[PDB]
Design a binder for these strands. Structure first.
Ligand SMILES: O=c1[nH]c(=O)n([C@H]2C[C@H](O)[C@@H](COP(=O)(O)OP(=O)(O)OP(=O)(O)O)O2)cc1F
Ligand SMILES: [Ca+2]
Length: 427
DNA sequence: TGCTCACACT
DNA sequence: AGTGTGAG
């Protein structure tokens, strides 16, 4: 009976990352309710990142800025840079690289998004445990750490509660056994306090972390005590944790599959999966999903932290909603050329920085009237980092989609253009 | 929201 | 390949 305690895994997550990047650059905005927007001319801008001050008012991602100002009249905004008619994330990718390089000094990380990485600390934990003689862990080593499900048993202030929970954990900690999985988690989190202490010292950014035994738990745990805090979710907190945890809060159960787990099975919380056999779960959801759900609701997951701090694709997309859909052939050239131009800037940087070339160009369009994120994906070869050739070749492989009999028109009008560089080879 | 990115299925 | 899902 194996219990998924073999690894120590952490998930770190930059608290409102884009906001922090803007607040480091423009100090005026620090410690105020503020958000980052892109494209101001439509309803003040779509909001893509919201500080915690601003969230206390209810400002959320994907509002329009004009609606966020209704909820938060003193809300400060920063706008994303625009390059060649489109939002340009280069400042945030560069802060992201800053943080990931720091994290890498500690343990191998899997970049998961521009603002989070997973951390396999199985190996760093063993080494620390031998430098540590066997001496107890001081509560002073975990000054921003919450123990989930503690305190329990026979203080009205938040910091008060945390200390009581950490004292209880440490008081019962079995430091003489260099193999108790709870002790490894504790050491895992000491390493995460230091790793987080150095992000802040060396970039000024604050972040939250989750320390558990796999990636799903660490990600849940990270969310439990935001902002600027870390949470140990031990194997033993799982039954109480999952007992009232909605299915949709576990990673990858937030969409259609989770909804079917809810409907088909007639349950609400992750804990309720444990009453079904593995073959039962497989019969509703397939061999892989039933297996995955059977182990997960018992706190067991095996997805490895992959040693991958660089993306597999470089992508450049722009939407054209509404009357702004592209209706003329020479409109479609121009944006393609705009898209191929930013793609080229970024490809050359990536060759120079990271020693690889992309070999396949993926083009994708949206048609006025279709339903889905994409309406069509097509590819060709990517042999030169040249905007004019990349955009020419991208046109070539989409020109037949033009249903219009006219040459100078384009029917149906295009609602999105997308270029993606993939298939990387060492350079 | 829009602009990304990883991945499973076929 | 090309499509669909899930996420930040
Ligand atoms: O829908 C989105 N839009 C959207 O621009 N981004 C962008 C902007 C954001 O700063 C950055 C971070 O992604 P996160 O979803 O993890 O959120 P954070 O801002 O870092 O902090 P917290 O999770 O609120 O504590 O991606 C994510 C989306 F998911
Ligand atoms: Ca986050």
């Amino acid at each position: 009976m194996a219990t998924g305690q073999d690894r120590v895994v952490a998930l770190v997550d930059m608290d409102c990352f884009f906001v922090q990047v803007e607040q480091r650059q423009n100090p005026h905005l620090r410690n105020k309710p503020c958000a980052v927007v892109q494209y101001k001319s439509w309803k003040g801008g779509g909001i893509i990142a919201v500080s915690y001050e601003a969230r206390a008012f209810g400002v959320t991602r994907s509002m329009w800025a004009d609606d966020a100002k209704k909820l938060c009249p003193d809300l400060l905004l920063a706008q994303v840079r625009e390059s060649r008619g489109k939002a340009n994330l280069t400042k945030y990718r560069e802060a992201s690289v800053e943080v990931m390089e720091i994290m890498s000094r500690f343990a191998v990380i899997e970049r998961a998004s521009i603002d989070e990485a997973y951390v396999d600390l199985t190996s760093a934990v063993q080494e620390r445990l031998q430098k540590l003689q066997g001496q107890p862990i001081s509560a002073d080593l975990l000054p921003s750490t919450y123990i989930e499900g503690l305190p329990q048993g026979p203080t009205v202030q938040k910091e008060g509660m945390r200390k009581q929970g950490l004292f209880q954990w440490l008081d019962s900690l079995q430091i003489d056994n260099l193999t108790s999985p709870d002790l490894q988690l504790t050491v895992g989190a000491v390493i995460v306090e230091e790793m987080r202490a150095a992000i802040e010292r060396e970039t000024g950014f604050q972040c939250s972390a989750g320390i558990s035994h796999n990636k799903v738990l660490a990600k849940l745990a990270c969310g439990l005590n935001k902002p600027n805090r870390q949470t140990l979710v031990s194997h033993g907190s799982v039954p109480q944790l999952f007992s009232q945890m909605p299915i949709r809060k576990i990673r990858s159960l937030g969409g259609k599959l989770g909804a079917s787990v809810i409907e088909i099975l007639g349950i609400e919380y992750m804990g309720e999966l444990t009453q079904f056999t593995e073959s039962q779960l497989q019969s509703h959801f397939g061999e892989k999903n039933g297996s995955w759900l059977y182990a997960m609701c018992r706190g067991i997951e095996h997805d490895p932290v992959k040693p991958r701090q660089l993306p597999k694709t470089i992508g450049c997309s722009k939407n054209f909603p509404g009357k702004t859909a592209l209706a003329t052939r020479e409109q479609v050239q121009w944006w393609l050329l705009q898209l191929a131009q930013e793609l080229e800037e970024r490809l050359t940087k990536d060759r120079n920085d990271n020693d690889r070339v992309a070999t396949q160009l993926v083009v994708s369009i949206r048609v006025q009237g279709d339903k889905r994120l994409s309406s069509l994906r097509r590819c060709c070869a990517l042999t030169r980092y040249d905007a004019h050739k990349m955009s020419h070749d991208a046109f070539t492989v989409i020109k037949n989609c033009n249903t219009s009999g006219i040459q100078t028109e384009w029917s149906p009008p295009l609602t999105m253009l997308f270029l993606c560089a993939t298939k990387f080879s060492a350079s």
